[PDB]
Amino acid sequence: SMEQVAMELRLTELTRLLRSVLDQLQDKDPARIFAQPVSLKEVPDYLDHIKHPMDFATMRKRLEAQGYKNLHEFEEDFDLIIDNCMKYNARDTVFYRAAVRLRDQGGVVLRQARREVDSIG
Questions:
Q1: In sequence order, what are the residues at sequence separation of 6 or more whose Cβ sits closer than 8 angstroms to the Cβ of residue 107?
Q2: 95-120 burial, b for 16+ CB within 10 Å, e for fewer?
Q3: Which of 13, 89, 106, 115 is the most buried (most CB within 10 A)?
Q4: Which sites are covalently linked via Glycyl lysine isopeptide (Lys-Gly) (interchain with G-Cter in SUMO2)?
């Protein structure tokens, strides 16, 4: 149907906008602390602590499969990256501190992404 095509075009355009959002959030992580999944070889207990691991490469796979239907879904995954790190790592660590800085900086980006998603529809 033409209606199905129109919905697919909307999803594609959202995907474009989330790609640009993702690039901008990842730039706020120049150390690349959040770039890849935590290694279970190197942190064998990780899944005892963290139930839903998340990282930028995993978000990028989901994104390229057009797997985010709305901005809320994408934000959930971004929040997991931050929130997982802030639980596993102590306040005095470079990891936790990097998460705090990503959250704070990412906030700015997400604020305008929400307006753009609403605005363009």
A1: none
A2: ebebbebbbeebeebbeebeeebeee
A3: 106
A4: 41
- DSSP letter for 84, please: H
CATH number of the domain where residue 101 is located: 1.20.920.10
By what technique were these coordinates determined? X-ray
Give the range of the structural domain holding residue 64, as residue numbers without chain letter. Answer: 1-121
- C-alpha Rg value of the chain to the nearest Å: 16
Number of domains in the chain: 1
List, as own/partner pairs, every contact residues 91-96 make where C-beta atoms lie below 8 angstroms and the sequence separation is at least 24, other chains included: 94/31, 94/33, 95/33
Query: How far, in Å, CA of 38 to CA of 103, rounded?
Result: 18
Rounded to whole angstroms, the Cα distance separating 34 from 102 reads 10
Contact 81, 105 (CB under 8 A): no
**Closest C-alpha to 47, from 88, 13, 94:** 88
